[PDB]
Amino acid sequence: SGNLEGEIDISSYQVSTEAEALVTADMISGSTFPSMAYINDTTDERYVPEIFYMKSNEYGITVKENAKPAFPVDYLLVTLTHGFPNTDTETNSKFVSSTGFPWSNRQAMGQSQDYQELKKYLFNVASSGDFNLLHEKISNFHLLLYINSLQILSPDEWKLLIESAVKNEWEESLLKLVSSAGWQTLVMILQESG
Amino acid sequence: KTATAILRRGKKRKNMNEVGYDDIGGCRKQMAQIREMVELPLRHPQLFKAIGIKPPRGVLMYGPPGTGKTLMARAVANETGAFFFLINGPEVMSKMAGESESNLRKAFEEAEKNAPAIIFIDEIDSIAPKRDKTNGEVERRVVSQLLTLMDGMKARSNVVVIAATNRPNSIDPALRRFGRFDREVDIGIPDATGRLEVLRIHTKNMKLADDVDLEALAAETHGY
Numbered sequence: 001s002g003n004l005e006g007e008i009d010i011s012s013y014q015v016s017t018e019a020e021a022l023v024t025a026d027m028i029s030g031s032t033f034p035s036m037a038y039i040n041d042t043t044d045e046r047y048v049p050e051i052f053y054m055k056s057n058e059y060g061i062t063v064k065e066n067a068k069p070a071f072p073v074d075y076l077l078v079t080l081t082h083g084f085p086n087t088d089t090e091t092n093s094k095f096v097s098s099t100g101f102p103w104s105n106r107q108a109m110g111q112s113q114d115y116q117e118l119k120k121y122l123f124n125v126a127s128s129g130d131f132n133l134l135h136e137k138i139s140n141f142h143l144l145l146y147i148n149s150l151q152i153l154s155p156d157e158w159k160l161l162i163e164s165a166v167k168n169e170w171e172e173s174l175l176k177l178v179s180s181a182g183w184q185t186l187v188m189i190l191q192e193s194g
Numbered sequence: 195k196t197a198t199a200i201l202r203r204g205k206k207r208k209n210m211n212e213v214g215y216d217d218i219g220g221c222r223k224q225m226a227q228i229r230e231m232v233e234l235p236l237r238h239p240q241l242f243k244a245i246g247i248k249p250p251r252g253v254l255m256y257g258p259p260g261t262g263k264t265l266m267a268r269a270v271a272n273e274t275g276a277f278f279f280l281i282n283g284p285e286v287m288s289k290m291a292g293e294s295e296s297n298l299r300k301a302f303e304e305a306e307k308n309a310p311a312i313i314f315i316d317e318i319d320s321i322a323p324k325r326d327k328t329n330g331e332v333e334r335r336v337v338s339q340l341l342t343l344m345d346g347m348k349a350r351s352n353v354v355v356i357a358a359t360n361r362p363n364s365i366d367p368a369l370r371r372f373g374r375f376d377r378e379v380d381i382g383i384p385d386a387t388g389r390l391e392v393l394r395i396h397t398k399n400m401k402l403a404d405d406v407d408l409e410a411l412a413a414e415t416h417g418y
């Protein structure tokens with residue numbers, strides 16, 4: 001949403017265990033006031049008792065106020081803290097990716113996964129070698145999902161592909177995959193396709 | 195004669211829901227009074243409109259423990275077939291501070307919302323003892339809430355409140371005034387015929403031997 005200074009900061013939250021148990025029995029709904037949540041009625045299926053929200057006043061005394069019409073939702077939240085891994089290169093990530101092959105269903109923009117994009121992204125590396133370059137091009141989450149959806153490779157071929165793309169020891173598995181018949185057919189058709 | 199004019203005539207309109215008039219014995223007069231005070235206002239409400247009166251609602255049963263007050267209340271409720279809301283003294287009093295009043299409020303509100311209803315406040319001496327015994331402020335909030343709910347009900351009609359307690363003095367005096375638990379019923383120890391009826395009621399599923407003299411047991415058991 002953005003911080004107090006006008007940036008694109010990010011915040012993480014988590015609803016309490018009673019809000020989780022309140023919504024299951026309906027009993028709550030959004031209100032025209034953004035900060036306050038409404039309360040439903042005692043119909044013939046759902047029975048809602050009187051709801052009190054407890055707060056402490058400036059004099060250190062807990063005060064219970066009936067809130068049938070609406071109550072603030074700040075009593076139904078717990079705040080987490082986000083962050084990023086230190087600049088020290090630990091490289092415990094599962095993918096050197098997120099910049100390349102287009103993501104999931106973004107058809108609204110020009111990001112439309114298709115055979116042409118594969119032919120332009122994952123073909124020059126497969127036409128030259130440099131197994132390291134091929135590995136760093138093959139370790140894209142969305143690329144793996146897309147090739148799986150293509151269903152050209154059989155389940156065992158895809159299992160060895162994922163373990164080649166996500167496991168720290170991939171030389172032998174990468175060689176087996178690139179030598180596999182399924183991968184050979186995939187690359188051949190990809191080259192033939194325009 | 196006239197007193198038991200309501201007792202004369204499947205079963206139970208056909209757990210603890212199966213209790214009926216056939217599961218009681220030896221309390222003909224008290225049963226007649228309770229039925230006359232409960233059934234008529236609910237089952238046949240047009241009589242009092244025709245004659246132009248507001249029937250009394252609050253009924254206060256009291257007697258030694260074990261005399262069948264809960265049994266009578268539940269039997270009457272199940273025979274009338276009216277929305278029956280059961281409030282227990284200790285059950286309400288075991289709630290946290292501030293919930294034992296909201297429970298009463300919602301109980302009365304629900305009983306008013308639905309069709310002709312009966313509210314049985316079992317062991318009312320627990321939630322409204324005599325003032326000298328109402329130690330604490332929550333014990334006064336609950337009593338005041340009970341009084342307010344009782345007062346605000348007189349207009350609604352088609353809702354009868356029944357309460358049970360061991361002794362007439364065990365209840366707060368303010369609950370025994372006009373528009374409140376005004377009609378009072380006293381349950382006493384049964385006589386020989388009543389004890390025989392109770393004995394027959396209870397020993398109807400046992401494998402009694404042929405040499406049983408239930409009349410003899412009824413004669414011997416005095417004060418039971």
Ligand SMILES: Nc1ncnc2c1ncn2[C@@H]1O[C@H](COP(=O)(O)OP(=O)(O)OP(=O)(O)O)[C@@H](O)[C@H]1O
Nearest residue numbers: 217218219220259260261262263264265316358392
């Ligand atoms: N005619 C009868 N009078 C009294 N009790 C009877 C009668 N017939 C059967 N019983 C049995 O006697 C016992 C009476 O228990 P009950 O709960 O009615 O007593 P109580 O002291 O009036 O109630 P409570 O304290 O719960 O309000 C129950 O087992 C009931 O089944």
